[PDB]
Design a protein around this ligand. Sequence first.
Ligand SMILES: *[C@@H]1O[C@H](CO)[C@@H](O[C@@H]2O[C@H](CO)[C@@H](O)[C@H](O)[C@H]2NC(C)=O)[C@H](O)[C@H]1NC(C)=O
Ligand SMILES: *[C@@H]1O[C@H](CO)[C@@H](O[C@@H]2O[C@H](CO)[C@@H](O)[C@H](O)[C@H]2NC(C)=O)[C@H](O)[C@H]1NC(C)=O
Ligand SMILES: *[C@@H]1O[C@H](CO)[C@@H](O[C@@H]2O[C@H](CO)[C@@H](O)[C@H](O)[C@H]2NC(C)=O)[C@H](O)[C@H]1NC(C)=O
Ligand SMILES: *[C@@H]1O[C@H](CO)[C@@H](O[C@@H]2O[C@H](CO)[C@@H](O)[C@H](O)[C@H]2NC(C)=O)[C@H](O)[C@H]1NC(C)=O
Ligand code: NAG
Ligand code: NAG
Ligand code: NAG
Ligand code: NAG
Ligand code: NAG
Ligand code: NAG
Ligand code: NAG
Ligand code: NAG
Lengths: 48, 48, 30, 383, 48, 276, 49
Amino acid sequence: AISSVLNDILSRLDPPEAEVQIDRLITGRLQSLQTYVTQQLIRAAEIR
Amino acid sequence: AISSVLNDILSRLDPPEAEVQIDRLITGRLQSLQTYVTQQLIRAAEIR
Amino acid sequence: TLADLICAQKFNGLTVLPPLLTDEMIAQYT
Amino acid sequence: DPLSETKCTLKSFTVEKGIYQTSNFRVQPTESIVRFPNVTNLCPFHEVFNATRFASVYAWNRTRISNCVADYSVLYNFAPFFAFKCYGVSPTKLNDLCFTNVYADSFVIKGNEVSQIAPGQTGNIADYNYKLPDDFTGCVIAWNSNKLDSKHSGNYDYWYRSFRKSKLKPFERDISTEIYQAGNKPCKGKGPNCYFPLQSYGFRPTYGVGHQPYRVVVLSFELLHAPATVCGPKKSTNLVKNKCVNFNFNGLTGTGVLTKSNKKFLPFQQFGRDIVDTTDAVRDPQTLEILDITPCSFGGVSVITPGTNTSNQVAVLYQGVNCTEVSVAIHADQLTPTWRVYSTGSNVFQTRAGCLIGAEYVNNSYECDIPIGAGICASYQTQ
Amino acid sequence: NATRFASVYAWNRTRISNCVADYSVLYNFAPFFAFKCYGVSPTKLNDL
Amino acid sequence: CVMPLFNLITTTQSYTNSFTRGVYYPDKVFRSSVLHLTQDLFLPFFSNVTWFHAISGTNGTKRFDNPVLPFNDGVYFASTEKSNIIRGWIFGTTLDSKTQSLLIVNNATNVFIKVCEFQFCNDPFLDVYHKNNKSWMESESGVYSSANNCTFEYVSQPFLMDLEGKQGNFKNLREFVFKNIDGYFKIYSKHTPIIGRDFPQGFSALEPLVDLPIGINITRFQTLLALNRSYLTPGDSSSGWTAGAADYYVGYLQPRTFLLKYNENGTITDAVDCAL
Amino acid sequence: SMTKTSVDCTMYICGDSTECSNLLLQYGSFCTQLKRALTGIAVEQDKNT
Ligand SMILES: *[C@@H]1O[C@H](CO)[C@@H](O[C@@H]2O[C@H](CO)[C@@H](O)[C@H](O)[C@H]2NC(C)=O)[C@H](O)[C@H]1NC(C)=O
Ligand SMILES: *[C@@H]1O[C@H](CO)[C@@H](O[C@@H]2O[C@H](CO)[C@@H](O)[C@H](O)[C@H]2NC(C)=O)[C@H](O)[C@H]1NC(C)=O
Ligand SMILES: *[C@@H]1O[C@H](CO)[C@@H](O[C@@H]2O[C@H](CO)[C@@H](O)[C@H](O)[C@H]2NC(C)=O)[C@H](O)[C@H]1NC(C)=O
Ligand SMILES: *[C@@H]1O[C@H](CO)[C@@H](O[C@@H]2O[C@H](CO)[C@@H](O)[C@H](O)[C@H]2NC(C)=O)[C@H](O)[C@H]1NC(C)=O
Ligand SMILES: *[C@@H]1O[C@H](CO)[C@@H](O)[C@H](O)[C@H]1NC(C)=O
Ligand SMILES: *[C@@H]1O[C@H](CO)[C@@H](O)[C@H](O)[C@H]1NC(C)=O
Ligand SMILES: *[C@@H]1O[C@H](CO)[C@@H](O)[C@H](O)[C@H]1NC(C)=O
Ligand SMILES: *[C@@H]1O[C@H](CO)[C@@H](O)[C@H](O)[C@H]1NC(C)=O
Ligand SMILES: *[C@@H]1O[C@H](CO)[C@@H](O)[C@H](O)[C@H]1NC(C)=O
Ligand SMILES: *[C@@H]1O[C@H](CO)[C@@H](O)[C@H](O)[C@H]1NC(C)=O
Ligand SMILES: *[C@@H]1O[C@H](CO)[C@@H](O)[C@H](O)[C@H]1NC(C)=O
Ligand SMILES: *[C@@H]1O[C@H](CO)[C@@H](O)[C@H](O)[C@H]1NC(C)=O
């Protein structure tokens, strides 16, 4: 995206043009969350 | 992407239009690496 | 030693839940 | 109410006994404050867009715009605009942003050459006269100037570079008059394989619209929220501290509380960032003071219920907050979940798991029934 | 620079092969109303 | 452009080592008690840097060394002097009136910065002279003959630089970093005192001084020395231009990744060169 | 046992923004799955102790 700050994207772009950057950020942060959750599950199995 | 080879994409397209294919390859290979590492972690837990 | 980093983590949706058994209860069990 | 939210989370009309993490509470902002600098003098846009004479395309005039108020409604006064193409920023938002610096690259081209002024474009003007950067951010305004840049006998004052050994790099101006050489034979003058790089436009009023002279101004902005400088025409609002507010510090937009601090900013420093690169402090443009930013309190909301069978009564755990903060937010009506559970005074209890509202604390000790946390449990009992 | 061009519904096909493709010749008689290259950057045609 | 005949000595480019000097602040962001990995144009640790001396000898031969020097991606300039002989710098590709050139000069009352197609002399310099044996003043007549098509002029920084005196050794470790980034001519600086004589071992972060949005092309630079019309060394009756003793080290910036340590105060205290 | 953590998917990805929240609602039940997994981990830690 053009920025890692969501407010900047919402403030500098129209909805149709800001939606692309918002979706890029959504994809990246969703992937980060799933990675963290998967590692947490594996570590929880080890701790169990 | 148009080609799976990084060198061909770089040698056939200008940076503004090559970057899209570069990012497609980057996303695919990042997903492949993440899948490999997750499977490795699960198999290592079994082996442990 | 348990684990600004904590404030920064707590500042974007990441919170830590306290354990159900306090360390006093664990000491009592032991 | 909390019980309906629990039912929706479980997607069932009956709820079993337990504690369910239903939602997340947030404290909403009460006021919105902006802080723009003392500058009041308008930017010299009229001088740039209404100059007596415009430089040639190969010698494009770079005007520096800084330390002024940039009102873009003035640009709409003289708006015969043929092209108003803004890349990276919405034009309608241009009045609400603060730009670090403005570069106005003004020149004159042909009518059909307007489309060449865009990132990634190719052409005579794009490659040999004026090339935009690949990551260009700003706007391009092209408008006809036939009535001012045309002569009956031919206006030859405008010249364009038609031949060059290599394409121009972005933001590169070429003024060399060396004769273009085709091949390996050196050129000592006009002749075969030798052409003058600069060709006169010869704009005339009798020519077609596509050949009429067009004045093009490229306004390039460096959208970084640190040096402030060129801010938009928005009225400043008095600073309020110790309250959850929507702050706008020189285009830096955010939500949170602002507090006086001891973060000893060096004279050149403008804002501070945390370990994880989150804005921790800001500098007030007017009073030149340091302000820690603390986002308004948020957290999880869990609903302790004895089951749909026994009763519809519920308790609410706001995880990881003071009970006084929740009480203050409720009093001013700032909590995001607007289903406030009735609190008597003995219902509010502060656990290390959070603030528990709707459950009465008894100085007894039973086997755990509903695990709240931190050694505290809950149960539906006759009292 | 052919003297006569074929009709659009009977578009003329020319087979260019077994020769060095020096694109600098095209820039000589180049009014160049449109030079749009799809899938390949025009600036890189001199190395491919 | 009038220059009295002197027995000029060919410049000798000595070599010394840079230690860990030349670390500046990468950005305006404040940071507390953190370690930051930043990639920027830094002076590599323990790299070798060039050393020049500007002095007037006792035998009449005066070492007036102001060679034209490359700029590349940036320059680190360390100066040790007592009479402020190093008075400014010039920057440009051709150093003539064909192309715009940048000039930084000490006016002894303010600081002058110009971006104009200056017609510099063969060796531009500032003329410091004593009028009426009462007033010392500096003139720029020896720098350029004329100025035309000026696009930027900046008279500011009313600072006399060294003012505490010459306690340790001139108390004038003047460290500067000049960079060209996105059309911005960036000057960072630090006025370090002296423990020793020359190039003391230690760490000193260079606080930024000024960003000039000149937006010009620079691929070469030169040093400007101060020439005074006699009456500098007591007991010398030689009526002629003389220059005080001064030393200056020049190093070149390279794209390097540095690990910088900010303490709770907000100041860089240490740095690590990731590829040393 | 280890540290029990709770992550708000909406706050983490699309902090206090409604456009981003509406766009994130088009990705299905990923956030609910993450919340369920983290809750299971926390309850498992309490059970372990
Ligand atoms: C190119 O732009 C410069 C800088 O704006 C013009 O020089 C003067 O700039 C000042 C400050 O904005 C204006 O008040 C003057 O009207 C400008 N002109 C003159 C003659 O002083 C310069 O004129 C511009 N050149 C062209 C050909 O447009
Ligand atoms: C809820 O906030 C109150 C008020 O800040 C906290 O109570 C303070 O505790 C400190 C430390 O013991 C005392 O010095 C103050 O006098 C208390 N203030 C008042 C107004 O009584 C309390 O600690 C907070 N709750 C939690 C769980 O930390
Ligand atoms: C398309 O037109 C070209 C000429 O523009 C034709 O190429 C000629 O083909 C003849 C066949 O006998 C050759 O003798 C010539 O040397 C070719 N070149 C020229 C310049 O005349 C080509 O055949 C045409 N293609 C079709 C399918 O009609
Ligand atoms: C960070 O800056 C502060 C403010 O100058 C320094 O605090 C001073 O420290 C000295 C040395 O101990 C004391 O004599 C002063 O009384 C302090 N001033 C105040 C207002 O508390 C602090 O020392 C700096 N940090 C370091 C490591 O030097
Ligand atoms: C533009 O300049 C012309 C010529 O000096 C002048 O007559 C006219 O009023 C100016 N327009 C504006 C809007 O300043
Ligand atoms: C801005 O103006 C206000 C009101 O006059 C004044 O108090 C303040 O000092 C000014 N700030 C600066 C930086 O000049
Ligand atoms: C409550 O649950 C019990 C079983 O635990 C069941 O017999 C009964 O029908 C339920 N409903 C009521 C109203 O008691
Ligand atoms: C192109 O064809 C025209 C018309 O026959 C002719 O006059 C001209 O010389 C030709 N040019 C080349 C380069 O062959
Ligand atoms: C720098 O120059 C010194 C002095 O000659 C030499 O010892 C050293 O090896 C040089 N360093 C490099 C990296 O070339
Ligand atoms: C800057 O000038 C130098 C020296 O003439 C030249 O080689 C270089 O290409 C120029 N850079 C730009 C960006 O025009
Ligand atoms: C230097 O400063 C004086 C005032 O002290 C000022 O009049 C003059 O223009 C400045 N510049 C020179 C002498 O180049
Ligand atoms: C200044 O600009 C004018 C007008 O374009 C030009 O003729 C001249 O060569 C430039 N340079 C100088 C030193 O006057």
